[PDB]
Amino acid sequence: GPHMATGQDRVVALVDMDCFFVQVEQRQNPHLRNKPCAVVQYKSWKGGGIIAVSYEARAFGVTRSMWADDAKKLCPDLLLAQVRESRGKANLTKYREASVEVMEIMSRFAVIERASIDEAYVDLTSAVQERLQKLQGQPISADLLPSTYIEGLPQGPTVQKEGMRKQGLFQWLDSLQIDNLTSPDLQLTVGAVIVEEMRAAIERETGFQCSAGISHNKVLAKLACGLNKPNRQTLVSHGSVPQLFSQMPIRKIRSLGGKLGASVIEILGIEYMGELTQFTESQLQSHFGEKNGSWLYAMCRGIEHDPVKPRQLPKTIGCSKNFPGKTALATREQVQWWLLQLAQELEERLTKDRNDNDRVATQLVVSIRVQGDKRLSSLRRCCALTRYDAHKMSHDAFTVIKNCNTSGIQTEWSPPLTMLFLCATKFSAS
DNA sequence: ATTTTGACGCT
DNA sequence: AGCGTCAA
Ligand SMILES: Nc1ncnc2c1ncn2[C@H]1C[C@H](O)[C@@H](COP(=O)(O)OP(=O)(O)OP(=O)(O)O)O1
Ligand SMILES: [Ca+2]
């Protein structure tokens, strides 16, 4: 009752760029705009592996992970843009720089947590309070929410997409209580107004479109964001949670898309997030551990307490290359050459990072996969990163991994290496 | 033969 | 530390 927390204390948004790498390439090359297209890495093997797909191409069934030759079977007119290759490997610099463009715009509005290259969480609580004081009881017009969906609406007593959106927005605003500056629903609505403004600024200043979710915590904001892509935003209110969760597969909730979510389904014999409400906190803790159990107990009721972390820059800078099938590195000299290529890219990015962000990495992490091991990483070792020097970093990585080689003749490498990974970590101010 | 990335938890 | 999970 009067002491039961409802997790309505914050306004949190999750901005997710639409088909991001595709949009970067379409901005650069207008011939690709409004076409079925995709972004591919490499080209020799089966036309290259697709890593991003425009919505026009998705309509044909083109997906990520697909080989371009196979995506051409579904979409013969598919256009392609290739990731730049440098030093013998794919180089993602263009997309990292476009990400900085968007993150810097978002940072003008609020503190952001960079979740990935094209996703950021925004804590809008303070900005919403300020805007509510400015509005000073004035109602919120539907014109201020031109691309917003209210999840769950319309309901109760037009066959067009936009018609449904406006019809739902009207019901929401009609019911909204603008008197109460502390009303969580009003706070979310003002949050959505601010996110419309943020998304307009991103599109104006970069050309890039995005989707967004607005709710009371990060998990609901992420879920909301995915409900109406592309180029739309969705408000998930606390009151919308029971219906929304009643048919929501557990795997759709962030962190439950893998083994833990599978175990929740198998152990409890349920399918949907809402069914979790029927277990006590101690029951969930008994099956999934103290932390996961408490998290699930609150999350299935719409309550998540994870903060939006004040962090705009990545905490690590890494470079990796796979060596699949017969191309696995089987000689020592070969291993050293690829470590040098990786270390040269890493040096370049680290030097730029140091100049831009006033920080220095202090640890180098070296990871490898051996041919036959199914695990993503077979071995991980660290050494000091004391100089931004590609020859030194590559020599040091070799030093830390050279004893993994079983071959009695050093010139040969066995078992063959199927992946090399260098990552700079543990930044200190400089 | 998806590849190339980040962030965070466990012991 | 080194390994594993989950996600762009
Ligand atoms: N598995 C992957 N491997 C390599 N790059 C990836 C992978 N997944 C995503 N990316 C890249 C390319 C994407 O443009 C970018 C953002 O990813 P993601 O948000 O999942 O999809 P997306 O932005 O392309 O489409 P959407 O509109 O559905 O968000 O990160
Ligand atoms: Ca995206």
Q: What is the resolution of this structure in A?
A: 1.8
Measure the CA–CA gap between A199 and A42, rounded to whole angstroms: 33
A22 CA to centre of ligand 2 in angstroms? 10
Measure the CA–CA gap between A258 and A292, rounded to whole angstroms: 14
Measure the CA–CA gap between A37 and A266, rounded to whole angstroms: 39
CA angle, corner A417, sides to A416 and A418, nearest 5?
A: 115
- Closest residue by Cα to residue A52 from A22, A9, A79: A22
Grouping H, G, I as helix, E, B as strand and the rest as coil, residue A406 is: coil
The amino acid at residue A404 is C
Query: Residue of the nearest CA to atom 8 in ligand 1?
Result: A51
Strand C: positions under 7 A of a protein C-beta atom: 1-8
DSSP A140: P
Distances (CA, A) of A147 to A154, A162, A173, A212, A336: 15, 9, 14, 10, 53
Residues 405-424 of chain A sitting with CB below 7 angstroms of strand B: 419, 421, 423
Write out the H or E segment, with its range, that includes residue A17: strand A12-17
This structure was determined by X-ray
CA angle, corner A306, sides to A256 and A215, nearest 5?
A: 85
Measure the CA–CA gap between A404 and A398, rounded to whole angstroms: 10
For chain A, the structural domain boundaries read: 1-18+89-249, 19-88, 250-307, 308-430
For the stretch A373-385, what's the b/e string if a residue is b when 16 or more beta carbons lie within 10 angstroms of its beta carbon? eeeeebeeeeeeb
What torsion, rounded to 10 degrees, do the Cα atoms A297, A301, A306, A307 define? -160
Query: Residue of the nearest CA to atom 6 in ligand 1?
Result: A51
Measure the CA–CA gap between A148 and A246, rounded to whole angstroms: 23
A17 lines ligand 1 (CB under 6 A): yes
Pair A188, A134: CB distance under 8 Å: no
A95 lines ligand 1 (CB under 6 A): no
Q: Which of A14, A15, A17 maximizes ligand 1 atoms within 8 Å of its Cβ, making it the mutation to test the pocket? A: A17
Pair A296, A264: CB distance under 8 Å: yes
Please classify residue A54 by burial: count the beta carbons closer than 10 Å to its beta carbon, then call 0-12 exposed, 13-18 middle and 19+ buried.
Answer: buried
Measure the CA–CA gap between A195 and A193, rounded to whole angstroms: 5
Direct distance between the N- and C-terminal alpha carbons of chain A, in angstroms, rounded to an integer: 52
Distance, CA of A51 to chain centre? 14
Q: Which two tokens stand for residue A217?
A: 């915590």
Grouping H, G, I as helix, E, B as strand and the rest as coil, residue A2 is: coil
A66 CA to centre of ligand 2 in angstroms? 18
A117 lines ligand 1 (CB under 6 A): yes
